[model samples]
Target: SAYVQRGAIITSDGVTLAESVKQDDGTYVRNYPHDGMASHTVGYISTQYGTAGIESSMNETLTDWRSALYSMAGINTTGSSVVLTINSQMQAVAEAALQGYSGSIVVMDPSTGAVLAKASSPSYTHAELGTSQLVDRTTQALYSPGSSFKTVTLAAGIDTHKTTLDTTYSAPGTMEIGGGTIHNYANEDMGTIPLREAFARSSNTALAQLGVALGADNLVSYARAFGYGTALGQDFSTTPSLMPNPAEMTTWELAWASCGLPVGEHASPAGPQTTVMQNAVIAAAIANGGVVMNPYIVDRVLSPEGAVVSTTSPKSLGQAVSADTAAQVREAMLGVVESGTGMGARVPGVKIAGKTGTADVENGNFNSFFIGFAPYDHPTLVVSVVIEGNGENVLGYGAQVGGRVLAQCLNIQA
Candidate 1:
């Protein structure tokens, strides 16, 4: 006898996200109540197709084996349930803000690594699965991080004791490096700016010099420590973010790489790159005092009777930097929102530490990026946003998107 009922997937707030329905045709259909809002997280189930996402990953628990046993006995039975750590409110806000872009936004609890929201644009309805919308850009897509990578470089430099936030530098409008010249976002040169000011302004020249001083080995070490070039072991699928090796980089390439530029000879627009998930980790690590907690989606498993069978515990990947370093970085990041390029992210009454990066994709277009966490004194949420431009050149800005998401996360009226 075929079972008529299946278990369900619910959110942390007890919202029923996915469920199996008995069709009138004597079959079952898997349905996502939230539709595309959580397509990547809840996944899909179909009789014609198999299953994917949480529907596939937790299929065994959701199968309703007891329902099967009872069906043979002419009695209706139920299956276990899976509860995710995701906050539905935050997820919807993230998705809504991320619309109209070919990018992603990932928000998480800095202290716990519990993902509150993970939204990827160019998304599709579950019915449109297997088509162009199949990929979850938040975890899957990789892009050059532009000035956002400066956050990492800053953390590395300070944590390695190579430099301090107050360290002063003469940031000219442009500097020749690696046989190519590099300039700030708009070639805005603030003369004799301290490292803190350079970071808030995202001075490519200053950061490049700092990266060179921190050296390749230290940069790579800090980057890897921050979860780059490694898989995060998340419940969902993710592509490992890349970090170039010091040994492989030429002196000039290393200099470019120091400032998150592309590490190669003749590489124009040298933006060091990373994924949205990795960026979130970077922000979260700083907010959590240098600890990069392992990110988790599902919060717990529930039996048919609604009893929790299991729950996820917060786990640290490791300390990415010393607490003192994170504190300094956090302060500098706050400057970004207060008086820097990240002014778009300023929320009244809320202290935000953030960084913004704009990468030149060419022909007067760019990929806008922002990584940040708030309230500053007692941080809770970390948000990372990346908005892709058109090669086919669609114009968008990540700081605006990231600000909206953060405002929502903090319950601040935007």
Candidate 2:
């Protein structure tokens, strides 16, 4: 695949999002730069804001026409088109499925960190970030990762050989950590269950218990290894999503840290977090057969003529777990979509493995998140979705919304 173009998803407060059609010139005319989902991924471009997203990531290649003259030592450059791992048809599905929602969706080729589709709701036009003073949420926004962070914690435990899917824990639907109660989403109780079930169900109590078992050092190690506590290079501006620091955590804090909650009825621990991009990296690690790659938005520096100037190869940051450990994580994650809390996320034919998250916000609202990949055995895409608004009937069931997006993006049969 040679360098061509990047895709964007999402809509703005006033914009109609993005749609595609054949132009009079016969070339497809969809929203350029981006509208909704891709706004964060592509950043923006304008006489005022300059450019972000793909604009910034590929600035060297797109602006420097001289790049076309240079070629990499050994590679194919038959065409100027950059064939992204993302299927454009699926990108449209993802963008459409999450209509009117307020959140973010990130899809990537797990093996290559090539983001297939990245979208966010209440998005601005690509032109906004480039011209006006506005920020795209997907790459720039920060929010609590909720149960999505469990995968990283689980990875740490699994990598250390400290736990397995078979590991069992009691979930009374509520757990006390440092005098704080970690409840299942919506305070629902799920008796004693397998660790895999805990993950699938997105049980806060279970995650807390596992966090206690893994401890701070172990958990942080896994979190950092999974790309938390670090940056996933995005040309768009971004903020850090915090994660607990074992070094500074008190016992009570650890309890809250373990389950992704604040301790006690009144506690609001926005204490430590890993960025959303970092959380995406954790999912990518699972998709990558256990290794976490340093995610960079730009795939390569190309010559203006489409010759490869410099390319980023996949580097194994470190194993989040052994092959066996990864396999077990996969099994548990698969169970999440197959029969657990994430069931709504299941695709008819393709096996899906993932984790869902629903967390409380300071404004008395909730956040929903889901992260995973398809074809459990050999994943092609790793997608992460985050949304807001979960109360009453909608509470604790965010995975379903995220799942629908995934199904559309993959073009799975009903």
Candidate 3:
């Protein structure tokens, strides 16, 4: 903790001049000294909470002394260090590239919740949020996932064996569902698109239609399977941002719920308490062959005297979808990066599977979205990125900034 702190402080001080600012006249505000890169991962510490972010999520090991009171009281056995799965090299690359941007990035090992590099722009420095708050953002901060939420849509459909990537549907650029019109990306129509292509292009109308086709009960069941309808029992007591109200709507309501739209105007489900980890579960499910690996930050627990007491092993939260169905979804996501909207995420010579999303925001700004993993064949790094503001500069597609920053952080060969 000591060494990491010093390094971050030095790195931040040199770039502090880059702190973000507003462009005024209806433009999005940008962060300074690299635009809040890794803010969510590094997090800000506050007096209210000793630490946040990864620190808070993984606090049990970082702060507790080996022979502390918790141990004496039998609440804890010992306190030891948490060796993170983060690869400093990849982390640094991501941080450097994302400088001067506004967003968050998460890179992890798909098989395990080993965060290689989790960066967020528009964040406070070590001098501000404190180490603990920085890491807490992962377990905190509810964010509207935009197209990233589509992963759950696919899960619901495929997991139930109601459809496959090969399943074809006729889309006329838009669909009316529950008194709302959902359109394809940029209001463009590709006629009859297969399930995979619809996913690759991030067609909202296609997905919304698919949701109705899948029925509500099945969608709700699959959402629950992916940990959407309930709170994942993380190490800390975290209240997840939103859970589908099974009691409030019907089966097709579950379908509309899959789209992530509000029941009324200004109704975004993700607000103060939503974290990207919830959506990452859906992406990880495809990376891990349809099984959601229960997320855990600490690898093990130690006795007060520094002896190994208990270790956290990989546990399957549940099979959100079958392995075969997951493979189909994986291939479809690969197409997203290879030949679709996520092309900016393509890593030369490595198999990259990814998805991209650009959505409208209040104040006439666009938000960028992306999620996927590298070395798609073997399935290594699972990453998700969201860049707030900077909508107009991207020609209305915010992914230009988010996707480029995401590629920079991935050190894998794709």
Candidate 4:
């Protein structure tokens, strides 16, 4: 062989994800150490097929040719190495959190937008690339975020001063929409309650009514403000989260959408959907006091000889809302855990702020979710989880999964 390909892809915590193993034939083959742990994230390189994920995105840094001449002279040399933002231990914790259902988990640094852990279930080894496991659900698969999306609507409402924690609404069990009706979860009529109370209990009627009051223009703009309907340019390939424009949505569409309901065909232009990572970003912005930091997986690159080749610094993607407004939303999210729908996500001795989402994608079918950050006073980790399954309690099921992972991430004993 005229050249030797050598490099390594590692997690922030110093565990190897992928590396090159020198063959007896003097050739080299890429090997993944963690197996399916980061399948779609560490990606795979194959002569029979094209590369994907970091393998393709950071190909140049990983296989820089500067060490080629040294190796040609029979001098052992190593190529450059890539250090990802992913923490292998955290990655494992997330992967382990998935139940029998297919789903995705995304953990991030609220301040830096550094992806700490990304785990997608129904995963396969690099050798099994032909399988549907090739899909990286963290950044690719889109699910209607359900009530987790209420965070966005709430942020918009508070930012626009359209509604406040004390703002009252006479919420009934069902609200008329297109001569049809949209009912609260379990048809629970919350009667007259404050906006904060409605949000805490996740009263769909209240959110739907509030959504109508804010209308499509405000909702769409606020969604965009949180980076929905926008493409995220991470080092790896990703699908953008989607939202319908003001012009495309009807009154009913806007109303239900306020509560994170999808009103049309799956993946259709009229429907709203978000990837797991996108949902984390939404929570991260609020956790970071309104700024959306530009997200990145490659934290740094080092030359084969160990000199720094490149580094990525945290940069502001701009505010999703004013800092004051985010503070207000933060308080309400705390209520979600302290006294509302997210009680299932509480960790002992730690104050958490978050929201739970249970999207009924079809007649009786559902997608469960939990999106939030921990150590409420000084947030460190942003966790977003979504599971694909059927039935109702799956909402609380997703919450339990998220709570377990968050506790593990923080190393909370007992």
Q: Quick one: best TM-score, which candidate?
A: 4
- By TM-score, the candidates rank as 4, 1, 2, 3
Pairs of residues clashing in candidate 4: none
Give Cα distance to truth, residue 66, candidate 4, Å. Answer: 12
Writing each residue's lDDT as its tens digit, candidate 1 over 265-318 gives 433322356778888999999999899987888788888788989887888889
Cα error, candidate 1, residue 154 (Å): 0.5
Please list the Cα RMSD from the true structure of every candidate, rounded to 1 decimal place: 3.6, 7.8, 9.5, 3.0
Q: Is candidate 2 or candidate 3 better by lDDT?
A: 2
Global lDDT scores for all candidate models: 0.79, 0.62, 0.58, 0.82
- Error in Å for residue 123 of model 2: 2.1
Segments of candidate 2 deviating more than 4 angstroms:
1-37, 45-51, 64-87, 126-133, 186-189, 234-241, 262-272, 390-397, 412-414
RMSD of 3: 9.5
Q: Report model 4's TM-score to 2 decimal places.
A: 0.92
Q: Is candidate 3 or candidate 4 better by TM-score?
A: 4
* Stretches > 4 Å off in candidate 4: 47-50, 64-78, 127-131, 264-268, 390-393, 412-414
Number of clashing residue pairs in every model?
7, 33, 45, 0
Give per-model TM-scores: 0.90, 0.77, 0.74, 0.92
Query: What is candidate 4's lDDT per residue for 1-414, written digit by digit as tens?
Result: 324566788888898988888777666777778678788888866666567788888877776564446446325556789999988888888888874667889899899999989988888887675444667888888888889989988998889888898999877888797565888998888899999999999988888877888888888888877777666645766688878867778888887788887785333465468888888889899999999876788888887776788898887778989999988888998999899998988888778888898887667778888898877887898899998875544658677788778889887323
The digit string of per-residue lDDT tens for model 2 on 71-144 reads 43113322121223334555566667557666667777778676656656666654444431244545677766
Provide the global lDDT of candidate 3 against the true structure: 0.58
Over 44-66, each residue of candidate 3 has an lDDT whose tens digit, in order, gives: 33576465544456544434464
Highest lDDT model number: 4
Candidate 3, poorest ten consecutive residues by summed lDDT: 3-12
